Symmetry: D3
Subunit: 271 residues, 6 copies
């Protein structure tokens, strides 16, 4: 199992830029070509994101074309910036097991040593995350029927406050409902999130919980500053690889930079 995990693409419509000056569409197209030019090729790509920025049809058309151009199976989930109906109309073809019901988009993947669970944490008319009871019970079923085989969950919103002044108020509001499932199921060992536009990580019993940086713009972590900052600090994504009995996630830079060069002992310490 090799997974390329990106999120918060925030696509705009043809010939628009985010905020009028950040070319999300180009940046993402770069990321796509970057991903499908990797030497060690992932088995699938996950997008946990706010796939589009405003939830408009023209935005999903760009998203469909650019994400369509990836040369991998995709697993896609909505965010607060998404519109459930339109997400399903445009993207369901790229991720068929999302289903047929916009209000219950979720699915399980049983192809690898660790089962993958994809869920919708987004709620209409708010930025905050909400886990619906049908989501929770589907989860309970999945985790029970799965037994010992470990599980990871992908969702847009972080299930608990992370001390981020800007991001916490708009976290998953009833995140306790998932936290409780980690108490029930020792098998559930990873939860991965978007929304924070940051690599922030934590542990709750067996579960490693982490948010991801965005593919384009990032938001910094402030503890007592309320200001809605965002910046163009380096974009990054997460690779997930099954390494024997371990799930290992490593950051893979999406920035363009110098190198690589080879390490050489003489060049390292001249005499």
């Amino acid at each position: 199992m090799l997974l390329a995990h990106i999120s918060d693409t925030h696509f705009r419509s043809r010939g628009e830029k985010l905020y009028g000056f950040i070319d999300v569409n180009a940046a993402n197209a770069d990321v796509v070509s970057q991903l499908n030019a990797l030497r060690e090729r992932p088995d699938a790509v996950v997008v946990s994101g706010d796939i589009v920025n405003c939830g408009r049809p023209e935005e999903y058309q760009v998203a469909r074309q650019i994400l369509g151009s990836l040369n991998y199976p995709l697993y896609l989930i909505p965010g607060n910036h998404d519109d459930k109906a339109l997400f399903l109309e445009y993207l369901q073809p790229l991720c068929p097991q999302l289903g047929s019901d916009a209000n219950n988009m979720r699915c399980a993947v049983d192809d690898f040593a660790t089962r993958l669970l994809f869920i919708d944490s987004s709620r209409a008319g708010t930025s905050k995350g909400w886990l619906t009871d049908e989501t929770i019970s589907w989860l309970e079923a999945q985790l029970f029927e799965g037994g010992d085989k470990p599980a990871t969950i992908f969702m847009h919103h972080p299930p608990l406050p992370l001390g981020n002044a800007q991001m916490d108020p708009i976290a998953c509001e009833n995140g306790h409902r998932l936290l409780a499932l980690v108490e029930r199921f020792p098998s559930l060992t990873r939860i991965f999130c978007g929304h924070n536009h940051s690599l922030t990580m934590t542990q709750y019993r067996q579960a490693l919980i982490s948010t991801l940086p965005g593919t384009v713009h990032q938001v910094p972590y402030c503890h007592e500053d309320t200001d809605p900052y965002y910046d163009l600090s380096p974009a990054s994504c997460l690779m997930h690889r099954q390494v024997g009995e371990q799930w290992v996630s490593y950051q893979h830079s999406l920035a363009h930079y110098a190198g690589p060069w080879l390490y050489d002992e003489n060049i390292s310490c001249p005499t």
Copy 2:
């Protein structure tokens, strides 16, 4: 508790640059000035690194002056690029609780909600890691006499393989001995490492185990390719904050970039 955690500074001597072209001294001086310019100030700074590149006294002279100019208490531990004797001679004044015996540099910090444990995994005459009999025992003593209070360990070498073709053969060789301690002690919940020059992370039981990017050069993760690559992709460090009952870690970029701007609802989605 706010911790600024950098690693793998790899200082060279006054004249010199890493490999002849990477100006580590400048980059670290920048990192230092960056750190002590933060609005939200950490309580201390951790450096888990190969503090110097060649284990030379003139490198420690530079490291002492530059790390010395941080306006924070420091916790410093060595790596395989360090020299036990010289590390102690030059850096012990900047971290007195390391002790007096260069072969058993260690200390516990008890000031915050989570106990901090600093150890030396470096072994003279090899790049690979080793936990000395006395270290393992001191580690187990800390957890045994510590009770419910959670513990995090800082060590240079990762205590398990991570699937990194380059970095795995030179991990901590008796790492399973520390993994044994996490199985036995439910209160050991973070292990943080240098060595890998990358953010790779995994959970074993309750423990979140993660390596850090370097302050300067990075090494990419390859599964198949053993070519000893390094590159100049973006440097970051890890901030550790206590958030009620959670230890949360977030990546703080040390690159220079555009931003920040403020998020504006109307600019985000114009009509």
Copy 3:
């Protein structure tokens, strides 16, 4: 009184770039978000500029949206690149006291310790500036009724030759008419200009007269080279602050760059 003073935006139509390669629209949107993310917030924003590049309706639509997104009262004036009618049709809403007559767009602001005077120096069918007699007499009235209270004037074209080979021929052709008002009114102490895409400054009796750099592209100052150069050297704007009895203007960079860091005496001079 804090004023953010930018000019020569040179907006193009939706999905055009200036000269086909300079993205003025993105650059300006950046500037806007930059301005309305300032920590010390100005009382208003002045645009002395060639607001659009070709004087086309589609250009004013972009200008209206982007300048509209600023979170400040705006004071806007035309330039040679503008079209008076269309300027008034699209932008008058953002700056109501321009008036109702495209041929006599001007206004006074009596909110601060120094009265502000906004005038139209642009003339149809030419690049050169022209001050119409009705402009001059309105000015005389304003300056007389104002008495001792100091005044500053904002206009597109510099009232006198500045020794700039390219820019002088297309300066304000009858700039003597304003120069004469500075001789009459000791109260008139600042004149600020666009057009030159440069920070070039001078003094005439009590009056400090200066042109501003552009928000995007700049034109260098040459004394005997006729060539119509322009470059992408760093963009900048002017802040005007009333400091007791002084009007102080300082340059505020619009470039993205490294820092800031804090000055430290030990880091400054090590021992």
Copy 4:
């Protein structure tokens, strides 16, 4: 008269960088080579700066070699970062008319339409400025015996507060004494300063008073915040040219940037 006016070079010794990471020596060497490569060549170069950072002899050795390699007559004055004695020992050969007495370095230049006055506002053992009794008197002597010929003064410290939270408490403390001279002498019309590392400008009577950006690092203007910031925003200098009866000053960027291209009417507005 063409003057190239740079300031605040802040040289460090041969090995070293400002604060450990800003390569002032390189940046100034670049600035120097840049200056003596200009197509339109200045008649002389003014340096109003803190020529060196720590007031050390080995810094003056560097400053001497680098400023020495300018192919222009130089006028150099000290700042609070300079050492009177050493400034004279090392730099007086590059500016002979400074004199022989390190406590009264001063000179008038009478070659152009405007008299040039160079003075030393620096005071041993403080960052703030001071005009010595003999300076003030020599200043008044120059203007008194000078008649109608206009005068400009070059000094390190600004002679009045400018609203800069950082830079104001360390302005020229008896600056009002020079302001007294501008009230009495209508021919004193420019005062130019270093210290602030910024282009801020104001008029007092006939005098245009302006500070300059540094050749390397800059300090931003804050009204409220006293945090001693500096940054690496774009460096520029000021060119001073006599244009008939006007002294005009224009900002010359020292950054490296794209351009120039030529303006083409058809490319500007395609059909």
Copy 5:
């Protein structure tokens, strides 16, 4: 004779980017303004290229406008990415002696000491080059009627394999037909090519044969790696100048960079 020789523009339609992220249209517009802002002005511009990327009408419209804005006579030839019919419909006006027949676009220029020959190496429905028999015989005629006067030929595809793993398979498939003409005609001394997006050069008897870098993206030379790489390494073009009896071609960078500065013997070797 001064010739500015660019190729492989790869224009996209209005508001598209190559691969969704490389702004070929802006990059080329930059190149155009760059070319027609040269101090030493060429006599004509040659484009050997894949002028457009997909062969679509909307693409030729952008190409027509941007190349139209050059202030020089153009000599234009098709590539594999072009569509012969549409190329002739849109671009023939900018290069009238291409002719009237899309299937036989070629021409000779007898204005300079060396005669220039422009030919179509592109073949419909393939990437590979093909020289048609009518092309070859037109060439034979031209070379015979020309006698001693030297000749250079411009074509899209390189007439022989260059050892480039990616590019060789899609070279000019019957390139032997031209190689044979160089054996027959000692007068034929330069052959210049696009297609390879690289400066790769070779000699066959009297003939110097070279490919050109692209104006935007480049493809690296690999000898046994099949992967279809491309990169954004620096773009460049070729200048051809008749220097007495010699045809000299020099690379002229299209990248933006620092300098120039003037060489100075003292600055070079200080004492």
Copy 6:
């Protein structure tokens, strides 16, 4: 045969930078590490350069260490910036076949399909080139006794004028004497040069004659202007590969840039 051919390294001594601001030592160290990191490894590295800038022993010390760290056999020849005696003392251990006599450094390489000829065109006390009587004779001896086997010559100075206002008066003064050898010997087919810091190329008979860019700074080609310019436009080198019967040379960028990505038919032309 794969050759990596760099030129004009211009090393300075340990402390120092070229002209005070260009860090040639770092740039060359980078180039070196870059070279010995190539996937397709050259059989040897040619350096035709002014290996050092001032002809100083401490510069050769640096050059020795840095060129010494290449993991390839080296062929080194001097330029006008070199010192014959010191070049031999310091670099002959890295290229033993240069000989023992500093006034007649030369050698033939016979290992590949094409004979390689390395010579010294540098002349003590001038920047211009000279072929010593014994050189010309040794050259003619090699070609005479060599038969059909093709030959390439590496020399610092270009053997004919190229129309470069700056570089022509300082070409190889008796260059016509080598041109005489190409007329007489049809097997002399490549001549490669440094000196010009540019890729300019021409053919004389069967010989392709080309100069190389420098590893660091470049000098632009002007026909009319003699101002001694240099700039920091992109550095590259030349790879020489034997491809059956063809010697092919391709430019390898040494800059750091975005890419590579893979070409995808569908991404190239979306529907």
